[PDB]
């Protein structure tokens, strides 16, 4: 999309990730599984909830009876009343249709941005320790157990702790 | 010694909800909400917790003048609005003009 | 009938917090704005891509 991640360099979504909108997939000796990034997902839920409530709650009306009744010699004001009713209809129909179109595009872009930013955060943490193998995936140059995975998903990855082990494996494999 | 894989991705589900965007029509999304109310209860209810005045077979002229076909109608001390039926025709039984009739209907509406 | 509503329509009352309705342009009460639209659906989730092509 606008940020190139959803339906972009990350081609498809995950049906096996049920606890959030954005997240991770890992695999090591101990197995594999899916986990949502709770921080980014909760921000998106807060933003989208606010976006929905704003579109609805900013419409506050007063008590009003639209209808009017006119006799056979009041045709001009009857048509004037019809013009007012039709004019509001056209304004509200046009604005409502376009607001939905424009906000849907921005919402899909917003989700695309979040997935893009999540990938970039991980890439900035891992640096040389992992290889970008495409499709939003990193393949480590050092074994990364469940505890190591939790550090990445929590943003507490210790690059120097594995930097030398990754360096040796990176330098051999590239020789 | 070289290791494992971590991947970043996003949610998917069995949703068939479709939304329109400015750039593309009929986009399937994992969650959506509807801004347009299109369902009604099919009844004439009480506005402001107050029942309407239902004239039945009479119009406002027949009701307010005391047409013999509306004498059965109950006299309520208040109403939120007035309901007539399209077939309601029992009005001024003696032919004539009801002066400022539409204005009177406005004053008696609530 | 014996029901309560804040928005009344000649073909029946509507109970809603949505800003728009397409029931009937002639309403009494605190009502949504009448529109000609048949569908006003707002995306909240992502584009749904459960499967990809065989590669």
């Amino acid at each position, epitope marked *: 999309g606008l940020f190139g991640a959803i339906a972009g360099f990350i*081609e*498809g979504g995950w*049906t*096996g990730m*049920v606890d959030g909108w954005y997240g991770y*997939h890992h*695999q090591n*000796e101990q*197995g*594999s*599984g*899916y986990a949502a990034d709770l921080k980014s997902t909760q921000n998106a839920i807060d933003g989208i909830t606010n976006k929905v409530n704003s579109v609805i709650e900013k419409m506050n009306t007063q008590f009003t009876a639209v209808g009017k009744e006119f006799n056979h010699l009041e045709k001009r004001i009857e048509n004037l009343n019809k013009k007012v009713d039709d004019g509001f209809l056209d304004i509200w129909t046009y604005n409502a249709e376009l607001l939905v179109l424009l906000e849907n595009e921005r919402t899909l872009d917003y989700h695309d941005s979040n997935v893009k930013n999540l990938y970039e955060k991980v890439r900035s943490q891992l640096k040389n320790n992992a*290889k970008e*193998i*495409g*499709n*939003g*995936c990193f*393949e*480590f*140059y050092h074994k990364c157990d469940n505890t190591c995975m939790e550090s990445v998903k929590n943003g507490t990855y210790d690059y120097p702790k594995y930097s030398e082990e990754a360096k040796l*494996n990176r330098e051999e*494999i590239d020789s | 010694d*070289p*290791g*494992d*894989t971590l*991947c970043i991705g996003y949610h998917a589900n069995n949703s068939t909800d479709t939304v329109d965007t400015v750039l593309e029509k009929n986009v399937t999304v994992t969650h959506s909400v509807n801004l347009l109310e299109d369902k009604h209860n099919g009844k004439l209810c009480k506005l402001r917790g107050v029942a309407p005045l239902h004239l039945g077979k009479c119009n406002i002229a027949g009701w307010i003048l005391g047409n013999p076909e509306c004498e059965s109608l109950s006299t309520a001390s208040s109403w939120s609005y007035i309901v007539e039926t399209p077939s309601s025709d029992n009005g001024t039984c003696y032919p004539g003009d009801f002066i400022d009739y539409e204005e009177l209907r406005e004053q008696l509406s609530s | 009938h014996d029901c309560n509503t804040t928005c009344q329509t000649p073909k029946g009352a509507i109970n809603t917090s949505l800003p728009f309705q397409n029931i009937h342009p002639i309403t009494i009460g605190k009502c949504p704005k009448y529109v000609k639209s048949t569908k006003l659906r707002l995306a909240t989730g992502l584009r749904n891509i459960p*499967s*990809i092509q*065989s*590669i």
Partner: antibody, heavy 124, light 109 residues
Framework: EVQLVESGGGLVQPGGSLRLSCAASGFTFNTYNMNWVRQAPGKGLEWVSYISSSSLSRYYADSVKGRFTISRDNAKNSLFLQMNSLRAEDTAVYYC?????????????????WGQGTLVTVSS | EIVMTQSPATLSVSPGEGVTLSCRASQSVSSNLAWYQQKPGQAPRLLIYGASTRATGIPARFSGSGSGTEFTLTISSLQSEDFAVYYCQQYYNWPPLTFGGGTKVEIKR
């Protein structure tokens, strides 16, 4: 068409060594993850080993860890399985299987296409 | 590991009717389940993946559904080339990649 032909199976005494190989054709071998699956005579299917496209990730079943080594030569479209310290229970048909592309794991099952197999017999 | 259970191991049915094979999971595998068909002397062949998606070339009489722990593989009209062994498989949590015992579908006479 996707083709996987494996070879190198035969007879080996217990404690001996054997090197299975698999020839891949009809797809971009250097982008796919690969697997070995074995089937003992009259028994079900047992996954043996996994290797990634880059060869960085290699996984093994508990019953072969330390004895089997999986490898891959992407330039020669070849998959290998080194078997050492072979026991009698290792007698089986060893299948070469193709998984998902690098980065698309768990979008397609890790054994999407299978080769015919090669028979390995471990006895004295 | 995640253990796959395929009970019963043998199903005897006539030729031309509906069969349903079962597979359950020691814990949820979401939709990362696949079905395979093996004939004696031949390699396994993929039929279903994603627990419902059918593989290229697989006839429409094969279908599967399920999520979490319980899954089924249904063949609507059993032809003669469909009498074989069928294994399920999970790829939600692996390694180890676990298959399941397999179910033999046999001609009833």
């Amino acid at each position: 068409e996707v083709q996987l032909v494996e070879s190198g199976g035969g007879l080996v005494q217990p404690g001996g060594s054997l090197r299975l190989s698999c020839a891949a054709s009809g797809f971009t071998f250097n982008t796919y993850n690969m697997n070995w699956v074995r089937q003992a005579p009259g028994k079900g299917l047992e996954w043996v080993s996994y290797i990634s496209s880059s060869s960085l990730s290699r996984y093994y079943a508990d019953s072969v860890k330390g004895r089997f080594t999986i490898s891959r030569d992407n330039a020669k479209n070849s998959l290998f399985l080194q078997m050492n310290s072979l026991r009698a229970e290792d007698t089986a048909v060893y299948y070469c299987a193709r998984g998902a592309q690098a980065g698309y794991s768990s979008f397609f099952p890790p054994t999407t296409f299978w080769g015919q197999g090669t028979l390995v017999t471990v006895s004295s | 590991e995640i253990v796959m259970t395929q009970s019963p191991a043998t199903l005897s049915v006539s030729p031309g009717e509906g069969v349903t094979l079962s597979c359950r999971a020691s814990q949820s595998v979401s939709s990362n389940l696949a079905w395979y068909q093996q004939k004696p002397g031949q390699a396994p062949r993929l039929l279903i993946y994603g627990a419902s998606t059918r593989a290229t070339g697989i006839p429409a009489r094969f279908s599967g559904s399920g999520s979490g722990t319980e899954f089924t593989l249904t063949i609507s009209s059993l032809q003669s080339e469909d009498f074989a062994v069928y294994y399920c498989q999970q790829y939600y949590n692996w390694p180890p990649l676990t298959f399941g015992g397999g179910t033999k579908v046999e001609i009833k006479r």
